[PDB]
Design a binder for this molecule. Structure first.
Ligand code: SF4
Ligand code: SF4
Ligand code: FES
Ligand code: FES
Ligand code: MG
Ligand code: ZN
Lengths: 48, 86, 115, 690, 208, 109, 125, 96
């Protein structure tokens, strides 16, 4: 890389991270989609 | 204790319903004139059998076979259920 | 008519005879199974389970189906006797980690949508 | 007879005179490639993909337009036919954009599939491609015009099926384009169908954009409940979620089309959903609770009150299983106050004769009539596929149409006799020229919309229309099975309710104000708490939070039509059953199962435990509800006419006005459509130009 | 037609057709059909009762000499009244040829075990029994070979579900491996790939 | 080469549906004479001449002229739009008082 | 040797299917509808048997689609409706059959687009 | 274009953040939540619109065979810009 540097992009990490498994920086999977069914919200006022 | 509804199921083109058909052709009209508040339901039925249904208070039901009945037999059965008998 | 070829039995009498023979063999095997596999059940429980498995198929009226059922039961008996099976396989008949699923309408209605 | 013998690949077949080469090849089970031919549109012949070789003929013919000649030998797989298909695919793909990964048509593309099957595997085109600007024809149909192959299917459908002349072609040659030439919204109740018939991704669904691919979808064949036509549909799902609605071909009912509400209101199934049982707390607010607590409260209130005190109102989207279950449950407490929100006259024959409240002629029949009279109804919005059938007859059979009501636009020319109900009497007496017109008609048809019946003088209106039908019958005799009398419904649950003995209308509720009220999906706002005594116990069962939910004491979350196997009866009286596409959300349950569990808690357990048992009970009450495609019925018009002649209720000097006066009203009509954001966009688009 | 199309061999096609005619003439009692595929493979469709004679002839005849059983398997076609199709593949070293013998059976009808004709069949017939449930009469030792001990049903059958009916996990309360009804975190996603346009005109079926 | 003219219409303050256009009474007499030539029930056949007549009075064809022809002949406006964009002698933009057209085809070239 | 068995065919006790998935299941026997997005008819030639849709829920991790129905993916292909019915009957499944729906023969005529007095005449082409 | 929810959790480009009463947030306690910080919608919104002197332009994403399939964009509408359906780049003709 000293004689053939890689192409520069502004989204490439400027700081390499090692394998962070077994560490508070580890990856935790989760669903990236939003809620599908919305429930009806009852009115806040009494009905009688 | 009392009549709530009547259901008559007759096959459209089976011989065993023929007499019942005659009833509806002739004697249903005046029977509805006499009973303006009684729901009588005429419905088509499967190749099985013609039938009459009577409903009473609190959902009590029992049925009567009308297979091969003539029109007079049909109206006799209908007046028997319509009266305080059987 | 109906033009079928038998497996072993020509009518239900011979099939019943084979069923009785297989039942005798399982009945004799149960105490040895309890000893060898070091099972925590009684011999009474094992024989009751054998009877229950036999009665699961009491409604069969086809001699060929009965012949195949006896063949499968003999396969299972041979498997048990030779210790090809392990304790987990024997205990799979008793469903000891399965929570009882209800059968009445109201409980089914409460838990979910399946009938 | 008149059949002629022709050969497809050396194999003999007999065809009717005037049959096209394409249909003859179809007789032996061979499908000719096509892009512009649609068997329900007028023949165009423009795409040129259907070119085939006839033996001993130097020129290939267009199979979709050319009539077979006696003794001809089609050759569908000769070298000439294959080279024709390859050349036509090459010309079609020359200017097509490299859009497949971003095109919604991706796995469902006729162009892609016919390229794979009949075209070459390579390009020798070395020029630049043409690109055209996009058109905006509304919020429902997304337009990407570069993809257009100029089939002209959209133009023929809009002109002939929909009745609108907004689409066309501007320019000529390579630059010819399909559009409106001006900023115009192609807005109509059948508009979405141009997405189905367009073979490419030029016309796509805007609500459906980018969400799914066809190979991952699961197909559930089901029925629509957005109106009383009962159109066959396919619900496409993926991983437990409803993706979209598609038409399913049914020749008798909806052909291959569906209305825009049937197609685009499904997203409302994801909004305002009742998911858990709710009860009123100490402060009078609705709060979540368990099924057991809610059922116990309802059962306690049910045990205390009996007979007249207990009442039920059924809504527009209720199924026959739930209806019969509720009928049995209220009968066990000696109650007969089981009503619907939609009024049908109970005078004379009433519900006793099925013929009285059904469209006897049927949807298929319209094709056999020559004169139709429509009274107090807008066919276009109350039953768009019925109006489509009427326009098909008007176009192909020269059907004459007359209307009594407000001069609504039906998309085809009709005779406006006026809007005064007294005109009906004038037709019945014989002083109107239309009386003579009906007198000489071989297959006269009279259709009365249920919407007209809602008004107070409806019993009178039905009597007058029955009088018109009787005059026709006595003057011309009965030709056989024609059934002049017809009733056009607009509510999916109405016909089954009437078949079950339910009393039409909410009048008995007002006559005998109940203490315990069962709102079974009833969101019409007909009965409020001003029409009921105080301390009235209102139980709402349904799937949406609408008019009927926030006024209830106990809320029971039910399943929508996409989440159960349920029976619906259309205007014709035909009975159809839906299938489970997805399960009900949260804690919601099947409606008849709710009623059966409630019956068990209250001690009067209903005899049925499964769906087959509840359908056996359904057969016990009304046997026609378990015949799932049969529409045959017996005519009892004479008896009903006799029974109608008894009372002589007076008409009103009030012009007949349809509820759906204009297109904007068509969209949001029921609780599912009122919760749909797509319908809100449609309403905003038809009210605001932009 | 030259570079990308597989070349033909008419000499082998003729030889296989003649030998199929030979076999059919010699054993009319059992041979129901003879076919030569386009890529020169000879198949003989027989009656089940002739499994043992036919194979024996094909192994011992001087002009046959198919002394090697390359494979034996079953195919499940639920639409047929006889569900299962039994396929024997034989190789002749003396004549450097291959032959296929096909027969049929259903769920309740045994097939004669051919261990006597070929020793290799033993495990093949055990495998067919295990995967498809086809019983073989007079088999020396017929039992499951591939499936787990006590496994119920036959996996290769079309009706059987891909993931089966039970799974296994270790349970600490009973301190052993247990079998329970299958639950899946992610359901297998069924794809509908079949194109609505016909691909091969040569195989078109009559329109009934 | 390429045509250059666009085949969509975008409203402008000088060309919109409310741009004033109406036939002169003499042009209405001519329209009646033009309409009479065709068989009854086939009045549309007059789209081609009457449209031209509009252009002969105004100079070009604003969108209001197309709307007026469509309303006079009771033809859907999109049909008149199709006719106007198909034929090259129709001027959908203003032109000069004198329209010079030079032929450049092969015999003329 | 033949033994002349007299009873209806029944193989449930040999298939190894748990009884829950034999008694509470409903199969549908049908010819699938043509996909309305396309004109090809090649997917409307054979009969299909498929089971009733059961519950699908959301995985707490990753939000995938979870099922507990082992027959949620099983689709069987048959030549004729009789074969499908026989298979379902011998396997002990309750079934619902739907008659095959074919498109009706339509009378097409290109010349009708230019009718002298008919309504069929095209306003555009 | 990152931004935190009222609970202090980062909101992803997708826009999903666990609700206040959602127990699933417990999966992040004593650990972290993976969020990519380079929002593509914002990065593509910074690119300048390319001005070209033709009605139809071509885009392949740059790099030739290393980009996307080549597409042609019409630039006749002057009220908007032509946007690539693959890369998101914008094109217009010299206007005003
Ligand atoms: S319409 Fe078909 S061929 Fe054209 S881009 Fe879309 S998928 Fe590809
Ligand atoms: S948009 Fe679709 S239907 Fe209309 S002309 Fe183009 S390809 Fe044909
Ligand atoms: S299908 Fe015949 S020309 Fe298009
Ligand atoms: S007038 Fe110029 S080429 Fe004909
Ligand atoms: Mg399309
Ligand atoms: Zn790009």
């Amino acid at each position: 890389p000293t004689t053939k540097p890689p192409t520069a992009r502004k989204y490439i990490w400027t700081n390499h991270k090692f394998n962070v498994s077994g560490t508070p920086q580890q990856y935790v999977p989760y669903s990236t989609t939003r809620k599908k069914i919305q429930e009806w919200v009852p009115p806040s006022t009494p009905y009688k | 204790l009392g009549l709530r509804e009547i259901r008559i199921h007759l096959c459209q083109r089976s011989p065993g319903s023929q007499g019942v058909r005659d009833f509806i052709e002739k004697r249903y009209v005046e029977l509805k004139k006499a009973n303006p508040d009684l729901p009588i339901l005429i419905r088509e039925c499967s190749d099985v059998q013609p039938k009459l249904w009577a409903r009473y208070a609190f959902g009590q039901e029992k049925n009567v076979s009308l297979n091969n009945f003539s029109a007079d037999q049909v109206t006799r059965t209908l007046e028997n259920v319509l009266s305080g008998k059987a | 008519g109906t033009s079928v070829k038998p497996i072993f039995s020509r009518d239900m009498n011979e099939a019943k005879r084979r069923v009785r023979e297989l039942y005798r063999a399982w009945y004799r095997e149960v105490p040895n199974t309890v000893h060898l596999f070091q099972l925590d059940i009684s011999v009474k429980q094992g024989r009751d389970k054998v009877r229950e498995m036999f009665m699961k198929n009491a409604h069969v009226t086809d001699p060929r189906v009965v012949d195949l059922l006896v063949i499968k039961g003999k396969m299972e008996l041979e498997e048990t006797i030779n210790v090809w099976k392990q304790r987990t396989h024997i205990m799979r008949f008793f469903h000891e980690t399965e929570a009882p699923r209800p059968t009445d309408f109201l409980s089914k209605f409460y838990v979910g949508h399946d009938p | 007879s008149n059949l002629i013998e022709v050969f497809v690949d050396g194999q003999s077949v007999m065809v009717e005179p005037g049959t096209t080469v394409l249909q003859a090849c179809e007789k032996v089970g061979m499908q000719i490639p096509r892009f512009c031919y649609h068997e329900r549109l007028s023949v165009a012949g423009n795409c040129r993909m259907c070119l085939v070789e006839i033996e001993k003929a130097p020129k290939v013919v267009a199979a979709c337009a050319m009539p077979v000649m006696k003794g001809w030998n089609i050759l569908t797989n000769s070298e000439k036919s294959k080279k024709a298909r390859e050349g036509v695919m090459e010309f079609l793909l020359a200017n097509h954009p490299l859009d497949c990964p971003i095109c919604d048509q991706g796995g469902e593309c006729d162009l892609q599939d016919q390229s794979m099957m009949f075209g070459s595997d390579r390009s020798r085109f070395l020029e630049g491609k043409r690109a055209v600007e996009d058109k905006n024809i509304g919020p429902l149909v997304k337009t990407i015009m570069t993809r257009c192959i100029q089939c002209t299917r959209c133009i023929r459908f809009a002109s002939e099926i929909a009745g609108v002349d907004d689409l066309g072609t501007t320019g000529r040659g390579n630059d010819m384009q399909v559009g409106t030439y001006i900023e115009k919204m192609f807005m109509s109740e059948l508009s979405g169908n141009i997405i189905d018939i367009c073979p490419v991704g030029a016309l796509t669904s805007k609500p459906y954009a980018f969400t799914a691919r066809p190979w991952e979808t699961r197909k559930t064949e089901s029925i629509d409940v957005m109106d009383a036509v009962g159109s066959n549909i396919v619900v496409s799902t993926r991983t437990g979620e409803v993706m979209r609605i598609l038409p399913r071909m049914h020749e008798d009912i909806n052909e291959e089309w569906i209305s825009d509400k049937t197609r685009f209101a499904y997203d409302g199934l994801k909004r305002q959903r009742l998911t858990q049982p709710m009860i009123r707390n100490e402060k009078g607010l609705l709060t979540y609770t368990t099924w057991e607590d809610a059922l116990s409260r309802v059962a306690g209130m049910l045990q205390s009150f009996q007979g007249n005190d207990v009442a039920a109102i059924a809504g527009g989207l209720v199924d026959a299983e739930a209806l019969v279950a509720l009928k049995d449950l209220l009968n066990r407490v000696d109650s007969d106050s089981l009503c619907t929100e939609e009024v049908f006259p109970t005078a004379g024959a009433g519900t006793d004769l099925r013929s009285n409240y059904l469209l006897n002629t049927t949807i298929a029949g319209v094709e056999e009539a020559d004169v139709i009279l429509l009274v107090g109804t807008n066919p276009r919005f109350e039953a768009p596929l019925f109006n489509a059938r009427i326009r098909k007859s008007w176009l192909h059979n020269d059907l004459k149409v007359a209307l009594i009501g407000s001069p609504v636009d039906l998309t085809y020319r009709y005779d406006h006799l006026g809007d005064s109900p007294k005109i009906l009497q004038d037709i019945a007496s014989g002083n109107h020229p239309f009386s003579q017109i009906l007198k000489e008609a071989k297959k006269p048809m009279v259709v009365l919309g249920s919407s007209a019946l809602q008004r107070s003088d409806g019993t009178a209106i039905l009597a007058a229309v029955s009088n018109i039908a009787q005059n026709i019958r006595l003057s011309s005799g009965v030709t056989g099975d024609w059934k002049v009398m017809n009733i056009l419904h607009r509510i999916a649950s109405q016909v089954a309710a009437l078949d079950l003995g339910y009393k039409p209308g909410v009048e008995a509720i007002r006559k005998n104000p109940p203490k315990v009220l069962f709102l079974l999906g009833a969101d019409g706002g007909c009965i409020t708490r001003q029409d009921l005594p105080k301390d009235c116990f209102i139980i709402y069962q349904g799937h949406h939070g609408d008019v009927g939910a926030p006024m209830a004491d106990v809320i029971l979350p039910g399943a929508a039509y996409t989440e159960k196997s349920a029976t619906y009866v259309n205007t014709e009286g035909r009975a159809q059953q839906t299938k489970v596409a997805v399960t009900p959300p949260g804690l919601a349950r099947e409606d008849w199962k709710i009623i059966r569990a409630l019956s068990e808690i209250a001690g009067m357990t209903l005899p049925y435990d499964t769906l087959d048992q509840v359908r056996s009970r359904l057969e016990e009450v009304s046997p026609n509800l378990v015949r799932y495609d049969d529409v045959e019925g017996a005519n009892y018009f004479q008896q009903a006419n006799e029974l109608s002649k008894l009372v002589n209720q007076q008409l009103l000097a009030d012009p007949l006005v349809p509820p759906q006066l204009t297109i904007k009203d068509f969209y949001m009509t029921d609780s599912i459509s009122r919760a749909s954001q797509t319908m809100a966009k449609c309403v905003k688009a038809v009210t605001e130009g932009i | 037609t030259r570079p990308t199309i597989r070349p033909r061999n008419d000499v082998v096609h003729k030889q296989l057709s003649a030998f199929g005619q030979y076999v059919a003439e010699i054993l009319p009692k059992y041979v129901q059909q003879v076919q030569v595929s386009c890529f020169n493979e000879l198949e003989i469709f027989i009656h089940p009762d002739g499994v043992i004679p036919v194979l024996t002839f094909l192994r011992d005849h001087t002009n046959a000499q198919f002394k090697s059983l390359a494979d034996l398997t079953a195919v499940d076609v639920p639409t047929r009244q006889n569900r299962f199709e039994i396929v024997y593949n034989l190789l002749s070293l003396r004549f450097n040829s291959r032959i296929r013998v096909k027969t049929y059976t259903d769920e309740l009808t045994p097939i004669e075990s051919s261990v006597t004709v070929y020793k290799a069949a033993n495990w093949y017939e055990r495998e067919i029994w295990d995967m498809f449930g086809v019983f073989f009469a007079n088999h020396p030792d017929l039992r499951r070979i591939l499936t787990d001990y006590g496994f119920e049903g036959h996996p290769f059958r079309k009706d059987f579900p891909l993931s089966g009916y039970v799974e296994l996990r270790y349970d600490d309360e009973v301190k052993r491996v247990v079998a329970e009804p299958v639950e899946l975190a992610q359901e297998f996603r069924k794809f509908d790939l079949n194109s609505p346009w016909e691909a091969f005109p040569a195989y078109r079926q009559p329109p009934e | 080469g390429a045509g250059g003219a666009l085949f969509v219409h975008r409203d402008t303050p000088e060309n919109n549906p409310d741009t004033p256009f109406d036939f002169t009474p003499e042009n209405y007499k001519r329209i009646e004479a033009i309409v009479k030539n065709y068989p009854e029930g086939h009045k549309a056949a007059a789209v081609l001449p009457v449209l031209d007549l509009a252009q002969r009075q105004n100079g070009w064809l604003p969108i209001s002229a197309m709307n007026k022809v469509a309303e006079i002949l009771q033809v859907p406006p999109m049909r008149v739009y199709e006719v106007a964009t198909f034929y090259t002698m129709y001027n959908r933009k203003p032109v000069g008082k004198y329209h010079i057209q030079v032929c450049t085809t092969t015999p003329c070239m | 040797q033949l033994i002349a068995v007299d009873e209806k065919l029944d193989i449930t006790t040999l298939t190894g299917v748990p009884e829950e998935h034999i008694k509470t299941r409903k199969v549908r026997i049908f010819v699938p509808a043509r996909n309305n997005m396309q004109s090809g008819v090649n997917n409307t030639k054979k009969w299909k048997m498929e089971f009733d849709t059961r519950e699908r829920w959301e995985n707490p991790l990753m939000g995938w689609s979870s099922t507990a129905d082992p027959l949620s993916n099983l689709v069987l292909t048959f030549s004729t409706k009789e074969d499908a019915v026989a298979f379902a009957e011998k396997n002990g499944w309750s079934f619902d059959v739907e008659e095959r729906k074919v498109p009706k023969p339509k009378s097409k005529s290109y010349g009708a687009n230019f009718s002298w007095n008919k309504r069929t005449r095209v306003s555009t082409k | 274009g990152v931004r935190t929810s009222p609970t202090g959790e980062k909101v992803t480009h997708t826009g999903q953040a666990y609700d206040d009463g959602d127990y699933r947030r417990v999966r992040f306690s004593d650990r972290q939540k993976e969020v990519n910080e380079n929002f593509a919608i914002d990065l593509i919104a910074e690119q300048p619109v390319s001005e070209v002197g033709s009605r139809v332009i071509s885009c392949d994403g740059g790099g030739g065979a290393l980009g996307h399939p080549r597409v042609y964009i019409n630039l006749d509408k002057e009220t908007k810009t032509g946007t690539c359906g693959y890369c998101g780049l914008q094109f217009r003709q010299p206007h005003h």
